[PDB]
């Protein structure tokens, strides 16, 4: 099918543009590629422009999408802001199929687009370790005191596997916690390069 060249885009403030590769691996196929940006609420948003927003890819080839900052410098300058890139691969079919029974599937890739201000206080390689936890009766709260979004996965409490979480900068997120879950917490994160970081021991606030 059609695959993206990255699983996230870190957009450095000040940059004129950032790119995202879109590759059609199907030699005999022609797809219509529709792309758009959504804000943290999942609503189409124009603060970031993705272009070309609609184009056709015939056969095996790579097309590059440009992502442009259209925020007018209005976003917070002490923390990252979250947006989502959406790339939909619309298939074509012969018009002769219009007289038959068919089901066409459009594949959509959705990845994070992080707007990252310049000169942030904490270096990115120091953020993951800063995560803290607050335990409740049947819930676990993740505390992120850093300017970076933390993608927490492989979150464990005892032998229990909890839900993954996306903890906002200088914010918190909460996940359900089975009443029998152990007190020993461990977790991993997905870093700037989309790589899973080594297990870290959870530290309580």
């Amino acid at each position: 099918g059609v695959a993206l060249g990255a699983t996230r885009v870190i957009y450095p403030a000040g940059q004129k543009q950032e790119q995202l590769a879109v590759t059609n691996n199907d030699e005999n196929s022609t797809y219509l590629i529709q792309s758009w940006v959504e804000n943290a609420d999942g609503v189409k948003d124009g603060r970031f422009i993705v272009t070309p927003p609609l184009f056709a890819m015939k056969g095996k080839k790579e097309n590059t999408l440009r992502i442009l900052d259209a925020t007018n410098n209005q976003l917070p300058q002490d923390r990252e802001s979250l947006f989502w890139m959406n790339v939909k691969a619309i298939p074509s079919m012969d018009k002769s199929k219009l007289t038959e029974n068919t089901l066409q599937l459009a594949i959509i890739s959705r990845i994070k687009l992080y707007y990252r201000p310049a000169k942030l206080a904490l270096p990115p390689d120091q953020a993951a370790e800063k995560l803290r936890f607050r335990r409740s009766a049947n819930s676990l709260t993740l505390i992120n005191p850093t300017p970076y979004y933390l993608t927490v996965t492989e979150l464990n409490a005892g032998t229990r596997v909890l839900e993954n979480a996306l903890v906002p900068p200088m914010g918190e997120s909460t996940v359900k916690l089975p009443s029998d879950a152990g007190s020993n917490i461990t977790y991993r994160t997905i870093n700037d390069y989309g790589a899973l970081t080594p297990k870290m021991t959870g530290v309580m606030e």
Binding site: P91, L98, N101, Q104, A106, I108, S109, G194
Partner: protein
């Protein structure tokens, strides 16, 4: 590394005449192993938000839509299906295409439905 890729016999599935069902050969693989999941989207006609509408123009059959199942379970729109760890070896999405009545009277004609399959990356 980049995003994963979906492979299919054809993303354009020729459905059997109603009534009938057919498995959808559709798999996904990644260059780097990672937990992956997907959800369906489109226009549905049932309160269950699981029967996708017929968009046929010429002579569309009324009273029927396309409903997908995985391991026998109906998959509603916007309901994430977790596939677990997906690496270099292709993993099937496990989908089967079925026809489901929308309630009304059924008439003769064809069915032309469309569904979106979204993969959100951590």
């Amino acid at each position: 590394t980049g995003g994963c890729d979906v492979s299919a016999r054809d993303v354009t599935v020729t459905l059997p005449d109603y009534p009938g069902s057919v498995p959808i050969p559709l798999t996904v693989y990644c260059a780097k192993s990672q937990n992956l999941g997907y959800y369906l989207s489109g226009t549905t006609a049932d309160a269950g938000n699981s029967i996708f509408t017929n968009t046929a123009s010429f002579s569309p059959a009324q009273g029927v839509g396309v409903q997908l199942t995985r391991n026998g379970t109906i998959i509603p729109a916007n309901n994430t299906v977790s596939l677990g760890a997906v690496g270099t070896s292709a993993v099937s999405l496990g989908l089967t295409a079925n026809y489901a009545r929308t309630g009304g009277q059924v008439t003769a004609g064809n069915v032309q439905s469309i569904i979106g399959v979204t993969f959100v990356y951590q």
